[PDB]
Amino acid sequence: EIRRKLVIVGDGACGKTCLLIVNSKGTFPEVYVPTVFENYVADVEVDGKHVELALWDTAGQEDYDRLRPLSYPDSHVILICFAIDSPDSLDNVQEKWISEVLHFCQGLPIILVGCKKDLRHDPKTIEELHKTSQKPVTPEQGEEVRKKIGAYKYLECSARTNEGVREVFEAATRAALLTKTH
Numbered sequence: 222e223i224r225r226k227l228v229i230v231g232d233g234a235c236g237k238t239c240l241l242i243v244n245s246k247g248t249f250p251e252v253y254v255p256t257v258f259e260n261y262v263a264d265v266e267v268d269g270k271h272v273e274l275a276l277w278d279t280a281g282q283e284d285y286d287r288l289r290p291l292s293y294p295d296s297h298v299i300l301i302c303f304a305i306d307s308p309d310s311l312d313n314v315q316e317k318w319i320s321e322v323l324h325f326c327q328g329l330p331i332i333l334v335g336c337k338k339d340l341r342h343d344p345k346t347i348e349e350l351h352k353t354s355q356k357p358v359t360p361e362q363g364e365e366v367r368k369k370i371g372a373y374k375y376l377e378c379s380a381r382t383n384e385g386v387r388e389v390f391e392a393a394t395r396a397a398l399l400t401k402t403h
């Protein structure tokens with residue numbers, strides 16, 4: 222039995238829990254419950270190998286800054302997430318999340334994950350951001366941040382539509398199988 226540990230971090234409401242549950246359970250949560258700390262598990266098949274990937278969900282809320290790092294030890298891959306309909310959430314990837322991850326997870330592969338990809342072209346979302354002179358995050362913007370934080374890959378996904386959800390955890394599992402070779 223091959224076992225690896227994934228930890229997902231990023232701003233509150235950036236869409237971490239919905240990504241984990243859609244990958245592992247296969248249904249979008251009908252109701253929104255802010256996370257404190259939860260652990261899931263998913264069978265991931267990449268390159269003929271079956272990996273039991275432990276999904277360590279964390280609190281994006283800054284009120285839970287203190288106890289969040291208890292999730293990090295013995296991690297094999299880190300997903301730092303942001304919401305594509307929130308440029309501010311991509312800022313916090315650089316301003317908060319990379320500093321924390323690097324304090325506790327020296328030498329790990331990081332996948333930068335743009336969540337809520339379905340909201341980029343959402344006419345409702347575009348109109349609402351345009352009111353505050355904001356635009357949804359572009360793939361080029363995520364690509365530059367990926368490069369600046371030294372993230373291995375940048376992947377865009379939508380838990381809502383299940384677009385690019387599998388590609389996130391397949392890349393994460395491959396990365397985790399390199400981090401530890403036993």
Ligand SMILES: Nc1nc2c(ncn2[C@@H]2O[C@H](COP(=O)(O)OP(=O)(O)OP(O)(O)=S)[C@@H](O)[C@H]2O)c(=O)[nH]1
Binds near residue numbers: 239240253256340379
């Ligand atoms: N449109 C869209 N909405 C999403 C998606 N994923 C999550 N959401 C919405 O965003 C909100 C936050 O979802 P959630 O996954 O709980 O964020 P989180 O990062 O876990 O939030 P927290 O526990 O750190 S406070 C919810 O209202 C949910 O419906 C997505 O892929 N597309």
Ligand SMILES: [Mg+2]
Binds near residue numbers: 238255256278279
């Ligand atoms: Mg959550």
